[PDB]
Amino acid sequence: TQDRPLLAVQEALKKCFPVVEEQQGLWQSALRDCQPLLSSLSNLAEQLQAAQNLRFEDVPALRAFPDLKERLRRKQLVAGDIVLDKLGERLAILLKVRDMVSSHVERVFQIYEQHADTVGIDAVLQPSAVSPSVADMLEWLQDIERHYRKSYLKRKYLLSSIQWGDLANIQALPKAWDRISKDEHQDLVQDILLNVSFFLEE
Amino acid sequence: TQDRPLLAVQEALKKCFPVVEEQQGLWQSALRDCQPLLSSLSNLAEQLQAAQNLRFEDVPALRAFPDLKERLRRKQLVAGDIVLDKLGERLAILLKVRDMVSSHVERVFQIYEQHADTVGIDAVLQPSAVSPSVADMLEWLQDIERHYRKSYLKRKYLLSSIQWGDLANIQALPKAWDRISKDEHQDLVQDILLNVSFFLEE
Amino acid sequence: MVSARKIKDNAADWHNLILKWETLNDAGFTTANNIANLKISLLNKDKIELDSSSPASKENEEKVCLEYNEELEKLCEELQATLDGLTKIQVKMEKLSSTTKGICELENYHYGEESKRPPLFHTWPTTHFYEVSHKLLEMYRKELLLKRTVAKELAHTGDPDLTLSYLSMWLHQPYVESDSRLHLESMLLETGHRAL
Amino acid sequence: MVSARKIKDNAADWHNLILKWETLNDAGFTTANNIANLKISLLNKDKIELDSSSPASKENEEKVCLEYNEELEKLCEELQATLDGLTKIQVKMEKLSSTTKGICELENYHYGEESKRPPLFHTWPTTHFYEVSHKLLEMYRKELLLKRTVAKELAHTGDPDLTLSYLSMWLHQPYVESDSRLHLESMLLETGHRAL
């Protein structure tokens, strides 16, 4: 009644793009949680920096309690590791989003490679009136799989560079973090899910 | 080696993106020439079909006009092969643009592989204030090499529909031709050249 | 030498008149295409009158038919102006073939009856300039007479496949063979116009 | 034109699914009627058991109670299989109402908001094809939910007058109004299936 080996691929794509929509919801909800956390990191960086600049100076009024610099710094560093532990939780969310898309798309590609020689090179390239061609369907999932892995690299490397000291770098964290998004293609996954939004509801 | 083993890669990129800028100008100047060529193919298809339908006609005005039905058909096919030959010239332009970028990017990536173990994983990922990171510079050239090669395949296969001779199929050539463009990443080569516009003038 | 310069002069005018013919034919094809769109728009309006068959489309039938008539006669006068333009070219073309026609009539006579033929340029005898001037003339004489018939019948017809074929004959002109551009070069290279 | 073929296609699929509903309703009424006769046959045998001698235990009562139950569970799966069949049809009904719904979604934009909507066939706008697809959907959506309730309560009930009314609602189907047969013809005569 219909082409059988194409239904297995069409159902694989009908089940894959709704997963990408869920993963993008957690991916975006995690990057939003990193906006105020890195802002408070830059704040604690300024406090630690100003305190370190005036840790060798001797203001006469604060000389009454010379054990003040040690207590103030410890309290600042405690609030710093609290922000770092919560930021690590958000990296775990971005890691989960990356692992889900990088594995489900590979499973959809296994279904495609099962019928790669049987569907025919002509049936894949042919598009519909509202559904893009099956070739564009798979290549767009590869571009989404690249976008999440290429961004997760920048998110993880930048959030591991803060541990390497550098009091000035952790003060400019939101400046380079917001650069990661603007330098990449932020409006890419939302456009692929838009062109295939007609293919999902049959 | 140089005082900085990465300078050989930055010099390769400073010479590669201006070349991609030239190739995109020829790539687009050829696609614009294909809009009226496919329109004239659909136009001659409508004329050829209507003229062939009227082989049984007996027009009183057709009196004293010898070989008019015969010559018109030959004359339509001559003007058709002229449009086909011009479309073949435009495919040669799109293929040359593809072979240029696919060769310059491969040469830039060979220069990178010479110093991959000597430049350091930190120098590549590190961006500047106005120039993106050298890693994104190479990865964007990988996306451009994909855009030209993945489009050239669709451009040639869709323009192979002329082999069917179907007057209805070649009448919808400009309808499906504009679909290839809008479905691709139209604002990609011009957008990558925008982020690197600060790196070139250094 | 004066007959030789007039052969080169006619050879130049033959090229200019061909360009004037194809240029006026382009403006004529725009007028004819507008005539076709006027016939199609009237048929489209006839279906709209049958859809909105209220007692207001039978009145708009008179309004549209008058705008159709005024624009049809305007396009018929515009197309007839293109016919007259191509006719002035054809008159000059008959004048180029008749002017050449006199040259060899007295050229073979000046030296008795077949004694020796002096080449007007390097190779082409004066007779060969006739075989080009006559074929080029007869091609556009047929083409002009056809374009007249297409202009008259295009406004009268209503058949879509006939309208397309009417516009088809006008765009690419049939009676002018494709080899006409080569025969012109074979004469322009001879007379000295085309660069050696 | 594409909207015209898909509307004609929906008009055919709307008719085909209705025929599948009435056919499954006959097989479902046979299964349900067998359940009703099974409830009555057990009551009739219970009256025969009361007319039996006092020196008799449940010898055949244990055999009949197991075979009666096993046949009841078999008939419950048979009737539920008819319910699932009608549900798959109703899902396709929703797929026909959303497909038609999308046809008019692109029809309302093609003609702005200030021009009349040209009829897709002879006398039917694209919007009217939705109002029929939506009402037809609402009718069988209600009918499906009722057939579920009647199927569940038929096996559970023991009231005779309630069992009779259960079969009456499955038989005639109340929610399917009599005007469903006329609206179906108004679709097929328009799309070109039935001769006007």
UniProtKB/Swiss-Prot annotation, chains A, B:
Keywords: Cytoplasm, Nucleus, Phosphoprotein, Ribosome biogenesis. GO terms for cellular component: cytoplasm; cytosol; nucleolus; nucleoplasm; nucleus. InterPro entries: CA109-like. One of its GO terms (biological process) is ribosomal large subunit biogenesis. Changing S181A: Abolishes phosphorylation by CK2 kinase. The keyword Cytoplasm applies. Changing L62R: Loss of interaction with CINP. No effect on interaction with interaction with AFG2A and AFG2B. Phosphorylated on serines by CK2 kinase. Changing L72A: Loss of interaction with CINP. No effect on interaction with interaction with AFG2A and AFG2B. It is found in: Nucleus; Cytoplasm. Part of the 55LCC heterohexameric ATPase complex which is chromatin-associated and promotes replisome proteostasis to maintain replication fork progression and genome stability. Required for replication fork progression, sister chromatid cohesion, and chromosome stability. The ATPase activity is specifically enhanced by replication fork DNA and is coupled to cysteine protease-dependent cleavage of replisome substrates in response to replication fork damage. Part of the 55LCC heterohexameric ATPase complex composed at least of AIRIM, AFG2A, AFG2B and CINP. Does not associate with pre-60S ribosomal particles. This is AFG2-interacting ribosome maturation factor. It comes from Homo sapiens.
UniProtKB/Swiss-Prot annotation, chains C, D:
Phosphorylated by CDC7 but not by CDK2. The keyword Zinc does not apply. InterPro entries: Cyclin-dep_Kinase_2_interact. Keywords: Acetylation, Cell cycle, Cell division, Coiled coil, DNA damage, DNA repair, DNA replication, Nucleus, Phosphoprotein, Ribosome biogenesis. Changing S168R: Strongly decreases interaction with AFG2A and AFG2B. One of its GO terms (cellular component) is nucleus. The keyword Phosphoprotein applies. Na(+) binds at S186. It is found in: Nucleus. One of its GO terms (molecular function) is preribosome binding. It comes from the Eukaryota. Residues 57-91 form a coiled coil. The modification Phosphoserine is found at S53, S57. GO terms for biological process: cell division; DNA repair; DNA replication; ribosomal large subunit biogenesis. Homodimer. Part of the 55LCC heterohexameric ATPase complex composed at least of AIRIM, AFG2A, AFG2B and CINP. Interacts with AIRIM. Interacts with CDK2 and CDC7. Interacts with the components of the replication complex, MCM2, MCM3, MCM4, MCM5, MCM6, MCM7 and with ORC2-containing complexes. Interacts with ATRIP. Interacts with CEP152. Associates with pre-60S ribosomal particles. Belongs to the CINP family. Component of the DNA replication complex, which interacts with two kinases, CDK2 and CDC7, thereby providing a functional and physical link between CDK2 and CDC7 during firing of the origins of replication. Regulates ATR-mediated checkpoint signaling in response to DNA damage. Part of the 55LCC heterohexameric ATPase complex which is chromatin-associated and promotes replisome proteostasis to maintain replication fork progression and genome stability. Required for replication fork progression, sister chromatid cohesion, and chromosome stability. This is Cyclin-dependent kinase 2-interacting protein.
